[PDB]
């Protein structure tokens, strides 16, 4: 009957129902997006001044993220505490306070209700009862962390610190890319015809990536690996030359690049559960934000980056190498479509299981990239948040012996 039944404790089998079950999608909103995770909101440099705000989403839940006069960043649910209207209607702007258009309730930059129109009535008629207290009404506030300029938010006050959530290896791998001031050089959205999870598995899919990389070498010796944090939720996939090892295109400038990191890493893709990506592909730098939209649709928001210190020539290298990424990327183009190929391929198979066995039943770091360890890691972190580990009856049916 259930199409979301896990086969056992292992993540080598994933029930295809997980990509279509709408009750389960609603649990993802309660237990993942509004649970003990960090949701990527924006870069601090996108809201540099007092009053600067952007609107975004944490899962299905609309968010305001805003700089205050103390130079700190705050975030709160974009939901008026009256009758539930969106408070901020613009994608971005600058404001002293947020005012709901419907009945003119006012909110400060923390999300506190500061004003209720005609709260005290008119003459001595109507208005709120004496029992009504503004400080008891407000949208949910988010806990905010800024790590290397990345603004994350959580609905949960008990989420681990961003440092503990990421772990030291992911922290260093982010700092390696975001080591100096960055500048947004372009924004693009892709609407993906698949459940969010298929795109996030794709980011973590070193198997597909190393197949596709190997194909392009048809047109210097490299090694790769996969790093998975302890929770399973976060990965890095990298490829590197050994600096100081001995040994088609009409415009080769597409792939001409420059050394700018103190290591041999030519490619580093990093994911943070449940929907953040940081990429370095040669001199191509970007952030991605993955949002669920409907059971079979998701949104991928690209933020292309340069460094504030780029020369004209270095910036032009990034503008050319951007042809490798995004919606029309020489590399990423198919990343927009493979998820949809799965969504459709499983149309008559809601009761069957994906097979994820490359590199064994491991959810740890590995040398090489012919592995699905970082895909199994995602399902490890997913099942923990979702309460979908082996529990109670099914565990008992397995462990009721005496060998």
């Amino acid at each position: 009957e259930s199409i979301i039944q896990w086969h056992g404790a292992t993540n080598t089998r994933v029930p295809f129902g997980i990509y279509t079950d709408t009750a389960n999608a609603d649990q993802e909103q309660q237990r993942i997006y509004r649970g003990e995770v960090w949701n990527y909101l924006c870069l601090e440099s996108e809201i540099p001044g007092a009053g600067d705000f952007r609107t975004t989403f944490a899962g299905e839940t609309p968010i305001v993220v805003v700089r205050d006069a103390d130079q700190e960043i705050y975030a709160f649910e974009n939901r008026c505490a009256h009758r539930g209207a969106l408070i901020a209607l613009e994608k971005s702007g600058r404001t002293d306070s947020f005012q709901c258009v419907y009945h003119a309730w006012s909110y400060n930059r923390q999300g506190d209700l500061t004003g209720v129109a005609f709260e005290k009535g008119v003459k001595g008629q109507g208005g709120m009862p004496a029992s009504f207290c503004k400080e008891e009404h407000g949208p949910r506030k988010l806990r905010v962390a800024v790590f290397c300029g990345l603004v994350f938010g959580s609905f949960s006050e008990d989420v681990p610190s961003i440092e503990d959530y990421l772990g030291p290896e992911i922290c260093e791998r982010i700092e390696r890319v975001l080591h100096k001031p960055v500048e947004v050089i372009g924004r693009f959205t892709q609407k993906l015809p698949n459940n969010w999870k298929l795109y996030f598995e794709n980011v973590k899919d070193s198997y597909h990536a190393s197949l596709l990389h190997m194909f392009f070498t048809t047109f210097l010796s490299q090694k790769g690996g996969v790093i998975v944090d302890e929770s399973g939720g976060h990965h890095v996939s990298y490829s590197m030359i050994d600096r100081g090892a001995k040994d088609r295109l009409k415009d080769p400038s597409l792939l001409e690049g420059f050394e700018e990191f103190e290591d041999g890493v030519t490619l580093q893709i990093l994911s943070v559960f449940p929907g953040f990506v940081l990429q370095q592909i040669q001199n191509s730098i970007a952030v991605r934000q993955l949002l669920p939209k409907s059971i079979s649709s998701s949104e991928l928001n690209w933020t292309y980056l340069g460094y504030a210190d780029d020369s004209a020539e270095q910036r032009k290298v990034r503008l050319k190498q951007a042809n490798l990424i995004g919606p029309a990327g020489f590399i990423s183009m198919e990343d927009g479509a493979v998820g949809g190929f799965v969504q459709r391929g499983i149309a008559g198979a809601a009761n069957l299981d994906a097979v994820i066995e490359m590199g064994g039943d491991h959810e740890g770091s590995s040398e090489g990239r012919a592995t699905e360890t970082s895909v199994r890691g995602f399902w490890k972190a997913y099942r923990k948040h979702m309460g979908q580990e082996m529990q109670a009856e099914n565990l008992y049916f397995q462990g009721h012996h005496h060998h």
């Binding site: 947004v184 050089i185 372009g186 924004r187 693009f188 959205t189 892709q190 609407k191 993906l192 015809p193 194909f215 392009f216 047109f219 088609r248 295109l249 009409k250 415009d251 400038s253 597409l254 949104e299 292309y304 910036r315 032009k316 990034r318 503008l319 050319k320 951007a322 042809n323 995004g326 919606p327 029309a328 020489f330 183009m333 198919e334 927009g336 479509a337 949809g340």
Partner: protein, 154 residues
């Protein structure tokens, strides 16, 4: 004088080339040192330089079509360009700056028709050997959203 009729005729041949999947002829619409970019109104209003496609030579355009033929994986589809009349902002007998409204339908091999993009071409035209050529074409999309992926240029 480069005029609105000549630009409309050039734009119809450009559209026919892209919509017939004669993509090998698409680079010939451009000068050797051209600029081509696909971007959106938000990037353009803020002065952000990056494109989904970004080219500063005809050779970069040719290489993109090579990759489309020999390298890229995408589900079979076609474009249908519907163009409005151009407006010339400035120009003479050999140069002009002009803006052309566009809409592109995407038709999947499976039959679905969607409005895939719309906006305006912000163009700089020159004359080479008596014939109109694009020095620059910026496709400024009305929407920040591309459905699935973009394989064919606008």
């Amino acid at each position: 004088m480069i005029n609105e009729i000549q630009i409309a005729a050039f734009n119809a041949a450009y559209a026919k080339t892209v919509d017939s999947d004669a993509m090998e002829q698409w680079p010939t619409f451009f000068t050797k040192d051209c600029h081509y970019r696909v971007t959106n109104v938000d990037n353009h209003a803020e002065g952000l330089a990056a494109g989904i496609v970004w080219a500063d030579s005809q050779d970069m355009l040719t290489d993109r079509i090579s990759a489309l033929r020999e390298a890229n994986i995408y589900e079979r589809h076609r474009y249908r360009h519907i163009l409005g009349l151009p407006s010339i902002q400035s120009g003479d007998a050999t140069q002009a700056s002009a803006s052309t409204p566009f809409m592109v339908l995407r038709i999947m091999h499976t039959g679905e028709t969607e409005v895939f993009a719309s906006g305006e071409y912000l163009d700089k035209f020159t004359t080479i050997d008596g014939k109109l050529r694009l020095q620059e074409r910026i496709a400024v999309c009305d929407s920040t959203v591309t459905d699935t992926l973009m394989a064919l240029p606008l």
